[PDB]
Design a binder for this molecule. Structure first.
Ligand code: HEM
Ligand code: HEM
Ligand SMILES: Nc1ccc2ccc(CNCCc3cccc(F)c3)cc2n1
Ligand SMILES: Nc1ccc2ccc(CNCCc3cccc(F)c3)cc2n1
Ligand SMILES: C[C@H](O)[C@H](O)[C@H]1CNc2nc(N)[nH]c(=O)c2N1
Ligand SMILES: C[C@H](O)[C@H](O)[C@H]1CNc2nc(N)[nH]c(=O)c2N1
Ligand SMILES: [Cl-]
Ligand SMILES: [Cl-]
Lengths: 362, 362
């Protein structure tokens, strides 16, 4: 059954991929080669062209992603050759460097060897390569609550955080054959951070807020033609609301809205004053302003939605079905000011794609 | 088949309704009476108790409604007795008066005779009893674009609007047996309107914005135990975002955001300035402030969401399933600041309920 599942996905993917690459005539010979290889070995190996286009298709098919217009310019790094933890570490370090690109962020994915018999070759524990630690003890809350369980797992392994609100978590990953993951402190020279200031309100810097420049998601599985790349970190650049409306705003995250209201000089006493809404707007203006000022790529939600409209238009004229998750595509502020809010989307799952997978801690 | 459909819904409704009213023992005798009546007449007549509780249940089951906490205090007016257009007119006038209640809005429904053989007894053309007209000709846009087709239909019938941006549409409805609806101008003494001013920004009154006090939805069908009340206008009070984030903000409605930005003294040139977001917040603060100042009931979206949380809690402890439409329950501004955004809802349709129906014009 596993072999049949693999072969079916392989047939679907190779046909579609080669059609898009104008290589339709080669499909017949390639599929035969694949069928023999699966019969012989239980699996098959993608060509570099297949892997690159597959990672791109998977981004294109990500229903929840508003940034899909740029799917075809994804920078794919093939690291199926790594065998050692030093190599994995250095590949991760390299990804941070090349994706960051001095602030001019390059959308990038680094692809590690895939699962064999469902057996992982490399197992990355980080949610993102750059992420802040979180602590909770005796009612005391420090840093990012969403990082509490990973932080606790790191500290089991001999890591110790400084317990600022912005401790950088180490890289942590496990190799096939090892019972325990290893961890490495991030070289600070690789990590760009942005202090949050406001264009008009000088007092905003009193909050001493900051965020990291590049979100590099490292815990999703890339699936391409029935091959499972559980370890394949990728990045784009941030949409501002991700930071200003969620990471810094949510009560279960950094929960900064009351403090924002105070520094912008409004009362936080009455729902009818819409103080949360006003605070959200100013914090979000601050985030966009700060990233731009530092020369780190970012997009606002209006521009992002305009790009997504073009993605919809592009899909139609290319004759491809559009899929999307309305509930995630709408931005968490002024959603009705975007075209997204006013239409619907088919939420069917199409492969290649990126998928959630179980945490190895917890 | 129609009779079977009716009887099945009747059985389901009477059982549930009488359970809730502690009248479970009476179900057996009532259902027999109903079965005979359907056999004899093709239909059945609700008791006053059944009708009142049915209209309440239908509100409770409205998946898209954030205001459901107060479902049980709905004021039900039984007008199944009306036979003439003067009576219908006067009932509609009465509803406006009693619901308005000098600004202290009473949630109210007036129920007219139901469809017979799918044959309407009274057919109301208005979307709401109080609503502004809309005009479009030679590129010239006046009033509410969403009212353009009804406005045009009214003007076919000899009505003429003054062509201000806030012309009150007349009541328009058709009686069984008539080929044409009749229309009646609304007495202005019945209609409360609210001028939009801002608490801090004096210039806001330069926009000369206003809205009506009470939204009285008059084009949905109430269904109760297989009986179709196509004519049954109802009202609550507004949630502020309905006016400030949609009616006055949408590009296809009054489209006021650029003008709002100008009077609050910000540029409307760059997406990254989040000028639409800031304008939306101030316009919405203005709406809430204005209604409160005039003594007309209104709720903000934060308070409304807090009430809805209590509705969820109430449903659970009463042992009732909760149903909801996430995409409509989230407010169109700062949705992630409400608990609604962070959970999911079962969107199953449960009866009694309110339903859309085809427009008799267009
Ligand atoms: C280039 C800039 C990009 C922008 C501005 C962008 C924007 C976004 C945003 C705002 C989200 C919602 C995230 C959340 O609320 O947690 C998202 C989700 C997502 N994006 Fe993108 N994205 C970009 C690039 C990429 C790239 C390069 C990939 C992969 C190759 C990708 C795949 C996804 C996926 C899989 C999700 C869903 C994650 C989940 O379900 O939790 N995006 N994107
Ligand atoms: C008491 C104050 C009330 C508030 C604050 C409230 C709030 C809301 C809001 C904000 C909407 C969304 C409307 C839109 O975006 O177009 C809504 C929808 C709805 N409400 Fe309520 N509501 C209230 C009372 C009522 C009453 C009295 C009924 C009927 C008895 C009702 C039934 C509905 C229905 C059926 C919808 C869906 C309409 C549609 O699909 O277009 N509500 N409510
Ligand atoms: N700009 C982008 C691009 C791709 C992304 C892909 C994934 C994500 C994060 N999605 C999950 C966020 C999350 C999940 C669970 C807990 C939590 F705190 C936060 C953000 C992205 N941002
Ligand atoms: N406060 C309330 C309560 C109940 C409501 C019930 C219905 C509505 C309106 N829902 C449809 C609005 C609409 C539909 C179609 C076109 C349009 F311009 C506007 C608003 C309500 N507001
Ligand atoms: C938190 C919960 O999953 C919620 O229903 C969804 C709604 N839509 C979202 N949309 C985005 N972009 N990101 C999110 O985290 C969520 N959360
Ligand atoms: C306009 C379109 O129907 C859109 O998908 C929905 C989204 N959610 C909504 N929610 C509310 N409360 N009201 C609306 O008109 C809409 N519009
Ligand atoms: Cl993030
Ligand atoms: Cl309305």
């Amino acid at each position: 059954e596993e072999k049949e599942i693999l072969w079916n996905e392989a047939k679907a993917f190779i046909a579609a991929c080669y059609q898009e690459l104008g290589k339709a005539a080669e499909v017949k010979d390639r599929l035969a080669d694949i069928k023999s290889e699966i019969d012989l070995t239980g699996s098959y190996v993608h060509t570099k062209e297949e892997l690159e286009h597959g990672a791109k298709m998977a981004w294109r098919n990500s229903n929840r992603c508003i940034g899909r217009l740029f799917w075809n310019s994804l920078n794919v790094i093939d690291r199926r050759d790594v065998r050692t933890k030093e190599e994995v570490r250095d590949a991760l370090f390299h990804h941070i460097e090349t994706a960051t690109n001095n602030g001019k962020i390059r959308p990038t994915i680094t692809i590690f060897p895939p699962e064999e018999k469902g057996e992982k070759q490399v197992e990355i524990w980080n949610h993102q390569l750059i992420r802040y630690a979180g602590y909770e003890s005796d009612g005391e809350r420090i840093g990012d609550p969403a990082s509490c369980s990973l932080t606790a797992a790191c500290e089991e392994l001999g890591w110790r955080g400084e317990r600022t609100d912005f401790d950088l978590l180490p890289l942590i990953f496990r190799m096939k054959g090892d019972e325990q993951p290893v961890w490495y402190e991030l070289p600070r020279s690789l990590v760009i951070e942005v202090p949050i200031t406001h264009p008009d309100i000088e007092a905003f810097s009193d909050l001493e807020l900051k965020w990291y420049g590049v979100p590099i998601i490292s815990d999703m599985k890339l699936e391409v033609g029935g091959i499972h790349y559980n370890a394949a970190p990728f990045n784009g650049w941030y949409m501002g609301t991700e930071i200003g409306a969620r990471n810094l705003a949510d009560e279960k995250r950094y929960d900064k809205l009351k403090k924002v209201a105070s520094v912008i000089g409004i009362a936080a006493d009455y729902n009818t004053d819409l103080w949360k809404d006003q605070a959200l707007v100013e914090l979000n203006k601050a985030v966009l302003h700060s990233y731009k000022k530092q020369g780190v790529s970012i997009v606002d939600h209006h521009t992002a939605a305009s790009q997504f409209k073009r993605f919809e238009e592009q899909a139609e004229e290319a004759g491809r079905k559009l899929t999307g998750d309305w509930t995630w595509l709408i931005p968490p502020i002024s959603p009705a000011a975007t075209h997204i809010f006013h239409r619907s989307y088919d939420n069917s799952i199409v492969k290649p794609n990126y998928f959630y997978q179980d945490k190895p801690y917890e």
